[PDB]
Design a protein around this ligand. Structure first.
Ligand SMILES: [Zn+2]
Ligand SMILES: [Zn+2]
Lengths: 302, 290
């Protein structure tokens, strides 16, 4: 069923493992992800960025998600607005039957970022919906941030960053623990694609051009994980992996044109790449640790 | 509103036009189709092959199809099972809230086709659901088959374009053209150029289809034309932008490719602007018909 981030991350913090979070933008993706988490009996977070919602004129994406909830009802699935900007986006995501929200004001100075966040929190928790925010990275800063806002989780900064191009060639775990300890809440790692090496070579050898493309290498995420980090945001890898396959299939048989003939594989790679990843995140088997609290019951907490 | 195929076509036939029937598999494909029909105030048939439903595990299609219905209220949309075969395939798609179903048993001898269809028609109609069958052809057989089965539409073997009036008139019902693809110089050439390699592929001229529609083809099954157009744009982006790697960045232009290849087709079919023509009767109310 549809699950709160307080909880799914709750059981993550407690049990020293982390849940992978995936930006979805269409069906073949929601499907790739799902096939993986199900195979490894794993909880899952499905992320829809504000670009994903528009890409899919909102409704298709809500609907695709409800298919997953209903196809795999014993698998804790959380649906999560990624990088919220305003409060009205969140009204939007909440309206969509979403059950977690991120409000990203980390580009404002502390007090502004604090205020935006608090306004989102006030709305969401009123509905039982959880809230993730971002800072920076001073441990106290965190402690203030959280105490002053009451969010269910923190995006911390240890020098990852969005996209395929993170470091010129091929991180602070030391900060993740204190932050974890002095805050008592789960932390979150945005920017945690790996550009796995198979993903990359395949895109590159099949007409594509990203001869650079570093990532966070998994060992760093494993390490981070046990030192508090509970939610791991993964986007690029997914994009990359679908694209390699499509390109592969376009070269190896240019007579095919039914998109199903490359999207179907662009899907199965997503799922393959995902599987070791998830596995090292150490969330497998955990899918059925819990009675999943609904949103109305999630209201009690607050 | 979710619409029965009997009605949509009833109007198609009576007012002398066709409704394009469009195969769906995934999100971007439905957005393509929708934007066109909306942009042309056309009724639409969403088609769901049995392949299709398998690729989308049933439940993603049920639900994208459902998003069309709530995003575009004032559009008469009919959800049709394609190229069905078993009674159980209908029984199922009926319960994905489908509104119309084809039972294609036109491989079996004429008598067994009759039995198999009669099987579906008792099912479909009990629920209001509409039913399309297939023969192939020769006009006389077309008459009796309908007489003996009582389907709401009948696909045919036909380019041959004089049977269509005869068959239309002896049966008095909505006919249907399958495998109705044009393979326009441009979607093919867009492909071959950017690295593809299907060169010939034997098109079917839109002019022929228009002429058929006046003879009483009210439903125009299009698949491969839609498929091509997408694989058109994706190859383009792959060449012009080797670096680009986000699905949205090439999956986006495919969707448009679909939209901008349907628009003439629809126009030619003549459902442009008939979308507000009538009050849509619903699966419940429509039991009454039978
Ligand atoms: Zn982020
Ligand atoms: Zn047929």
């Amino acid at each position: 069923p549809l699950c709160t981030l307080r909880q799914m991350l709750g059981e993550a913090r407690k049990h020293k493992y982390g849940v992978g979070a995936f930006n979805v933008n269409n069906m073949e993706q929601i499907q790739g992800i799902m096939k993986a988490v199900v195979q490894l009996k794993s909880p899952v977070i499905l992320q829809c960025s504000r670009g994903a919602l528009k890409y899919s004129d909102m409704i298709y994406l809500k609907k695709l998600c409800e298919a997953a909830l209903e196809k795999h009802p014993d698998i804790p699935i959380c649906i999560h607005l990624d990088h919220g900007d305003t409060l009205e986006s969140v009204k939007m995501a909440i309206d969509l039957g979403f059950s977690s929200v991120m409000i990203d004001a980390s580009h404002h100075p502390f007090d502004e970022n604090v205020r935006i966040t608090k306004e989102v929190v006030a709305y969401a928790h009123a509905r039982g919906v959880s809230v993730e925010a971002e800072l920076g990275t001073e441990p106290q800063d965190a402690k203030k941030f959280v105490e002053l806002t009451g969010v269910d989780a923190l995006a911390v900064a240890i020098g990852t960053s969005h996209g395929a191009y993170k470091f010129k060639s091929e991180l602070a775990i030391d900060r993740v623990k204190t932050i974890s300890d002095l805050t008592g809440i789960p932390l979150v790692m945005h920017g945690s694609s790996s550009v796995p090496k198979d993903v990359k070579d395949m895109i590159n050898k099949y007409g594509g051009k990203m001869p650079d493309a570093v990532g966070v290498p998994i060992e760093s995420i494993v390490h981070a994980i046990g030192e508090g980090v509970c939610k791991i945001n993964v986007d690029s890898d997914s994009r990359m992996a679908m694209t390699g396959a499509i390109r592969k299939v376009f070269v190896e048989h240019p007579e095919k044109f039914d998109p199903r003939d490359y999207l179907g594989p662009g899907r199965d790679a997503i799922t393959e790449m995902l599987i070791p990843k998830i596995k090292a995140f150490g969330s497998a088997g955990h899918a059925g640790d819990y009675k999943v609290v609904s949103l109305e019951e999630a209201k009690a907490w607050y």
